[PDB]
Amino acid sequence: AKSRTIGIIGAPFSKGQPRGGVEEGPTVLRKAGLLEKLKEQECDVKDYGDLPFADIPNDSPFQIVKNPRSVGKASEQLAGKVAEVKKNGRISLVLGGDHSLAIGSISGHARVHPDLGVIWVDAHTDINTPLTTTSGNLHGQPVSFLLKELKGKIPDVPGFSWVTPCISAKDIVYIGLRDVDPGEHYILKTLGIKYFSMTEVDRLGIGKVMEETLSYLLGRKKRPIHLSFDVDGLDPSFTPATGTPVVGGLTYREGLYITEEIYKTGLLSGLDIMEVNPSLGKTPEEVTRTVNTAVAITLACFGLAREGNHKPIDYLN
Amino acid sequence: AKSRTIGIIGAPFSKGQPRGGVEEGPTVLRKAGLLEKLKEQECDVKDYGDLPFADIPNDSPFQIVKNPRSVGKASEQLAGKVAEVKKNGRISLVLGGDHSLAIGSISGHARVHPDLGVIWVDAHTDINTPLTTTSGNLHGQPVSFLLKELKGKIPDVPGFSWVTPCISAKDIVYIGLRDVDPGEHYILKTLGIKYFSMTEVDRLGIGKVMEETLSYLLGRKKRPIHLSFDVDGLDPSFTPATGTPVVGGLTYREGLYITEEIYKTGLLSGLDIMEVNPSLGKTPEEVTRTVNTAVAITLACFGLAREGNHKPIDYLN
Amino acid sequence: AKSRTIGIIGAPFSKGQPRGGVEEGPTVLRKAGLLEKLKEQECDVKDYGDLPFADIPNDSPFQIVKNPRSVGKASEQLAGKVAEVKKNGRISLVLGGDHSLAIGSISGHARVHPDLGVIWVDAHTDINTPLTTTSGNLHGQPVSFLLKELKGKIPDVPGFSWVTPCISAKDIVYIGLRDVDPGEHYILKTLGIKYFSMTEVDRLGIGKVMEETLSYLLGRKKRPIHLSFDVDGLDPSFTPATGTPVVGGLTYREGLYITEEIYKTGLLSGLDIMEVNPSLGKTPEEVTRTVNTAVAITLACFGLAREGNHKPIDYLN
Numbered sequence A, B, C: 001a002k003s004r005t006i007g008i009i010g011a012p013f014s015k016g017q018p019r020g021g022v023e024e025g026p027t028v029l030r031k032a033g034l035l036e037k038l039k040e041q042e043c044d045v046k047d048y049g050d051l052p053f054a055d056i057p058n059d060s061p062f063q064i065v066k067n068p069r070s071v072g073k074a075s076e077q078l079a080g081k082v083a084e085v086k087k088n089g090r091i092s093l094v095l096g097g098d099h100s101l102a103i104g105s106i107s108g109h110a111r112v113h114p115d116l117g118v119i120w121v122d123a124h125t126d127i128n129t130p131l132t133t134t135s136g137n138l139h140g141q142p143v144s145f146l147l148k149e150l151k152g153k154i155p156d157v158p159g160f161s162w163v164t165p166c167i168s169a170k171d172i173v174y175i176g177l178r179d180v181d182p183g184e185h186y187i188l189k190t191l192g193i194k195y196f197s198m199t200e201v202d203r204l205g206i207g208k209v210m211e212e213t214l215s216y217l218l219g220r221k222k223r224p225i226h227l228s229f230d231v232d233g234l235d236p237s238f239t240p241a242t243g244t245p246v247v248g249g250l251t252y253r254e255g256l257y258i259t260e261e262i263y264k265t266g267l268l269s270g271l272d273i274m275e276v277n278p279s280l281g282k283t284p285e286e287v288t289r290t291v292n293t294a295v296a297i298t299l300a301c302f303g304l305a306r307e308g309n310h311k312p313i314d315y316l317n
């Protein structure tokens, strides 16, 4: 089935942020037996491997923005590969790696599917511009590089001249926000982006959050969905091995429900499993928990249901 | 009062599953002060003691089905004891023991009240037949032996000739589901059994889940309610000392809300507190925590409300 | 802005209960940088200091009621300081200290704002009278001294001759109740007090609770709100360093949702942060977890929003 025909892309990249180890995210997710569990779930899995991100020495900052050429090239490479995987009729599954890679993941997906709608699962908006950012970390900036409305607000940053904004403010829904910088809150509110902070999740429950999310994106007509999942969108009690954890996150149950509802639409075309840093758990158990949750999240994206699952055969015969 | 009149049955049995210690559940629950706690709560409590489950050595498997004669005989003796407790005008409170004892508990209860409805609180459906089972552990099959619609699909298993299916597929509601086998999922779907998996709980909220459950079982006519509570129904952060734990469970609050709602009907007639295994904690606190949660669930079944309770007297005098 | 204009009152008092350390509550909340954090989110902050509570030797009990003169004088002192702050056109922020100080806090507030409405966030009703109490601890009795409808039910207790009942049973809403004594539950029913115990929060969701809480108090017209927040209203997994902890409490999210909703009305006029006891942590991390949670709740009462916050300028310039 289309909703179970997958292409795996490893993105061992970390230079989009300061904490080392997120480049081991595809490695630890593969070792956890992701490809195997997907095949046991009636999925047609093709592995495209891990992208070779060659080192860029003398990659001086653009103002305060660190490693621009490295980030820009990594996303340039991932775009080409996501566009490749999408042309072959497969759902692209990107194993991160820091959230800056979403520039390439969405741009590559948009090349083949321009009418795509984004669902962004994160504690963060990641919408800072190279001028609004105070950190200079490009994993907190991918959405600003992708929005057509922020054209003219993004300066010519080294390594990003290949970029062409591919999504409008209207094409994205955020779920799980709880750590939004003031510039980002200004962008979020002035551009009129649809969002569900933890406040909206609390008020409505995840049930109506999904009803409202999917209706907003798929009301007009059926269109491709790109889910960019940052594991820090979930509470640190489920994904502690992450770069920027924030308390009061989405439960494991909510995370499963979101991915379960997206599967049921049959419109998943792109998936990002981002910010798994296996060198950041306090105990070895913390690392396995994060990886186990990220694996559980991905399987739900491709059919695994909590009510059970069966093949089209009579089990009583 | 009828909703607070109780007959306690200790069912120290473990041969429905592979892990030793579930037979100590009735000891630990008593040791925790369950009898004293119910009497503080204005309950009329009679202790019927623990059932002697005399050794049945030479009980070789029926196909892949382990200990069939021991499991069947225990459920047959339990049925007889539940029927006697029911004849004494008391609510049978069976302290398990593995969940295979539900064959006996429900058969013996349906003997006195054939019009009963079942609420099954568990992470699992326990609806595998001796032919769909992969484990061959009978605690994962009790419901198949009880359903009228499965008559013809149950082989002639030694120790089970006394069993006549006593409930229709329409007289059962599952709450808590998150680990369902393929064969079980086929049965659940084709028989049209009402269930609220962790997906429905997430979607609706425990509030609507309880409203639908009580309307579905009592809307047509008021009838006795048999609640079969498997402690693995709750999240392993509340009930860790159990045989088959599954993440993303029902919360402590959700557990108490289910039971407070059942108490308020005044129609609870049978209760099963199953799968407590005091040998299965990672620490001695994990054990006390499971017993404490189980005790708390039991108290809510017999009137203990979080808003408070008071006797019919003038407290300001 | 009125909603962000604060008068800080430290109340290091513990004699309303038998556990040492609750007097260090103002100290640890200040140490964690509360004032600095409020100033950072555009609040006008005046520090009225930590009140000096003179020792009362020969403070003989009233029947079973412990330290009546000490608790009575501490509240009488706090009433004077709260009324002074209210007369300055500032919202009073009381850093406790046990909950018996709510006698002084609400009394002092009602002196300047007789039309006030109270939101009581607790695991407890704290409505026992000096005659219904079984512990004799005054922190479990403040509401009884404040309620107009309990005039004639409260005897002449030394230290409380200055008290005038200032709120009607119709002017208070409880949130989070799960440990209510018989006498308290009886007072709740005979006086027709509006409450949302954990049972109602479970049935309705924190969204409906807040819609209903605000419309019950403000339906007729706008009126000042006094939020009395006991940290034990929240689950011991978020606030463990407290004297009387009860399992199955409000989540970290629910706590913020309540306080974010109260900020939005712009009617917050009085606030108490009660029962933080830093000497009741099992580990130093338990203490920092209670304090950080208590700070998070306080900041949400004065504008900090999970969706984000921005100054009234152009960030894209």
Ligand SMILES: O=C(O)[C@H]1NC[C@@H]2NCC[C@@]21CCC[B-](O)(O)O
Residues within 6 Å of the ligand: A098, A099, A100, A122, A123, A124, A125, A126, A128, A133, A134, A135, A136, A137, A139, A140, A141, A179, A180, A181, A230, A232, A243, A244, A275
């Ligand atoms: O621009 C920034 O660096 C910051 N702005 C809000 C967040 N707060 C901490 C870091 C952060 C980015 C999260 C990036 B992440 O991939 O983890 O979602």
Ligand SMILES: O=C(O)[C@H]1NC[C@@H]2NCC[C@@]21CCC[B-](O)(O)O
Residues within 6 Å of the ligand: B098, B099, B100, B122, B123, B124, B125, B126, B128, B133, B134, B135, B136, B137, B139, B140, B141, B179, B180, B181, B230, B232, B243, B244, B275
């Ligand atoms: O038939 C089986 O063995 C399995 N079918 C689903 C469950 N998954 C693990 C074991 C299991 C039984 C749970 C039994 B219990 O009492 O814990 O619900």
Ligand SMILES: O=C(O)[C@H]1NC[C@@H]2NCC[C@@]21CCC[B-](O)(O)O
Residues within 6 Å of the ligand: C098, C099, C100, C122, C123, C124, C125, C126, C128, C133, C134, C135, C136, C137, C139, C140, C141, C179, C180, C181, C230, C232, C243, C244, C275
């Ligand atoms: O009057 C009493 O002592 C008791 N009545 C119900 C409660 N349960 C134990 C203590 C308690 C009051 C908590 C006071 B507190 O401030 O923590 O809410």
Ligand SMILES: [Mn+2]
Residues within 6 Å of the ligand: A099, A122, A124, A126, A139, A230
């Ligand atoms: Mn992100």
Ligand SMILES: [Mn+2]
Residues within 6 Å of the ligand: A122, A123, A124, A230, A232, A233, A244
């Ligand atoms: Mn993030």
Ligand SMILES: [Mn+2]
Residues within 6 Å of the ligand: B099, B122, B124, B126, B139, B230, B275
């Ligand atoms: Mn079971």
Ligand SMILES: [Mn+2]
Residues within 6 Å of the ligand: B122, B123, B124, B230, B232, B233, B244
């Ligand atoms: Mn189970």
Ligand SMILES: [Mn+2]
Residues within 6 Å of the ligand: C099, C122, C124, C126, C139, C230, C275
């Ligand atoms: Mn209190």
Ligand SMILES: [Mn+2]
Residues within 6 Å of the ligand: C122, C123, C124, C230, C232, C233, C244, C275
């Ligand atoms: Mn309290």
